[PDB]
Amino acid sequence: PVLVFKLTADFREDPDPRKVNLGVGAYRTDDCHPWVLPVVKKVEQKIANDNSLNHEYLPILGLAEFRSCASRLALGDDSPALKEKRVGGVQSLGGTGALRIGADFLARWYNGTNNKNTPVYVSSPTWENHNAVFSAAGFKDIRSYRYWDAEKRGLDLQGFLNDLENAPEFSIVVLHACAHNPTGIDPTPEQWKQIASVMKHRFLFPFFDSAYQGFASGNLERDAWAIRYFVSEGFEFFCAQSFSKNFGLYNERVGNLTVVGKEPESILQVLSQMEKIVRITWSNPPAQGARIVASTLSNPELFEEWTGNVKTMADRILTMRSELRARLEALKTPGTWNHITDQIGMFSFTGLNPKQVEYLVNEKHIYLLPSGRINVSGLTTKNLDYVATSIHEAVTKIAENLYFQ
Numbered sequence: 202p203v204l205v206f207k208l209t210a211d212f213r214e215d216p217d218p219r220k221v222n223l224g225v226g227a228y229r230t231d232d233c234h235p236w237v238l239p240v241v242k243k244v245e246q247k248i249a250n251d252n253s254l255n256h257e258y259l260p261i262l263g264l265a266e267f268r269s270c271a272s273r274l275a276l277g278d279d280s281p282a283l284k285e286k287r288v289g290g291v292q293s294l295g296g297t298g299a300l301r302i303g304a305d306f307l308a309r310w311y312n313g314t315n316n317k318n319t320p321v322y323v324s325s326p327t328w329e330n331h332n333a334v335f336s337a338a339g340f341k342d343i344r345s346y347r348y349w350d351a352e353k354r355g356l357d358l359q360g361f362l363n364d365l366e367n368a369p370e371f372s373i374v375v376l377h378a379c380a381h382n383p384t385g386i387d388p389t390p391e392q393w394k395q396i397a398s399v400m401k402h403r404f405l406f407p408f409f410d411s412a413y414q415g416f417a418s419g420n421l422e423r424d425a426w427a428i429r430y431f432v433s434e435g436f437e438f439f440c441a442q443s444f445s446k447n448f449g450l451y452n453e454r455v456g457n458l459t460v461v462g463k464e465p466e467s468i469l470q471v472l473s474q475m476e477k478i479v480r481i482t483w484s485n486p487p488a489q490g491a492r493i494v495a496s497t498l499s500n501p502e503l504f505e506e507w508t509g510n511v512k513t514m515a516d517r518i519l520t521m522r523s524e525l526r527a528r529l530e531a532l533k534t535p536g537t538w539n540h541i542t543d544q545i546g547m548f549s550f551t552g553l554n555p556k557q558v559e560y561l562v563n564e565k566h567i568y569l570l571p572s573g574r575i576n577v578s579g580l581t582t583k584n585l586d587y588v589a590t591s592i593h594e595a596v597t598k599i600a601e602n603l604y605f606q
């Protein structure tokens with residue numbers, strides 16, 4: 202599960218001046234540089250001048266203000282679950298750490314004691330590290346639900362539902378909260394209702410993965426609709442949150458595992474068990490990233506500025522999608538390209554085949570995944586024409602099948 206990071210390493214070492222990194226989902230400005238969000242520079246300065254801050258261990262489960270703030274962002278300020286004190290939060294090492302802690306919990310305490318046979322269902326296709334994290338937790342039966350229909354380039358809703366109907370009771374279902382990685386296609390709210398209905402009837406466990414809240418619609422509230430719907434339907438569930446993308450805090454490793462239970466006693470028990478799992482993994486979590494997020498989200502002014510920074514990223518992505526589609530169309534590139542602008546989040550699942558990716562990587566020094574996934578936030582007004590013309594070359598020169606064409 203380390204392909205994107207190897208892609209980045211190959212890109213850095215490449216001497217060719219034309220090179221473009223469209224692999225890893227990391228935001229870039231229109232001049233192709235990292236963007237430290239304005240709200241983050243401001244809160245960092247406030248931390249650097251605040252002499253009451255010490256370096257003593259945080260609690261095992263982490264910084265209380267951060268955990269509350271994060272769960273609130275997922276669930277909404279007026280969530281009934283918050284009001285009924287049936288919500289817990291475990292500060293984690295980014296989204297990955299939240300998924301891993303959640304996985305280790307389920308493998309020890311869920312559906313019996315030390316049950317490694319509980320099926321875990323992930324999307325077809327999904328993030329590379331999903332299978333790897335759940336296998337590391339010791340789960341033996343990892344399965345796929347139909348998701349991507351490559352013919353219609355949207356959701357195979359009937360397949361998805363049918364796979365969930367046939368899942369053994371109590372199976373764990375890893376659901377992308379919004380901004381599906383890699384397809385950029387999410388269920389509509391009406392589709393989510395049908396999914397939830399099947400999960401409720403078959404007692405399936407929702408394990409949400411929320412790594413991109415803000416990037417699907419530009420609006421934090423709207424991107425959490427599905428999480429909030431599952432709360433309202435009476436589910437207990439996990440939701441692994443990352444702030445790597447929406448705060449641009451990749452290298453400070455800031456995540457939160459939100460837990461929604463039936464009652465406060467449920468949460469107290471789950472959390473006391475999570476303490477043991479954290480202790481034998483990283484002991485307790487790092488402070489800097491969590492303090493930046495806690496400060497931002499607990500202050501109405503910084504919060505508003507932050508949501509404006511997220512909107513800025515989401516809007517730049519929209520523009521890059523429109524521009525790429527337009528240039529491919531003006532070049533008369535074969536096939537249709539509306540899927541570039543239909544898809545949402547950070548990525549486009551372009552539909553290019555593995556030989557077309559190989560051409561782009563080795564001949565044109567444009568780095569993307571063998572699947573055809575690109576990071577749309579890697580495109581810029583300066584690289585767009587090179588990327589479009591290169592895709593055109595690949596699509597016209599490299600056939601799907603060498604013979605019979």
Ligand SMILES: Cc1ncc(COP(=O)(O)O)c(C=O)c1O
Nearest residue numbers: 295296297328382410412443445
């Ligand atoms: C779907 C998905 N889940 C989890 C993660 C893990 O993020 P992190 O770097 O915060 O550990 C990513 C990457 O942002 C992701 O795309």
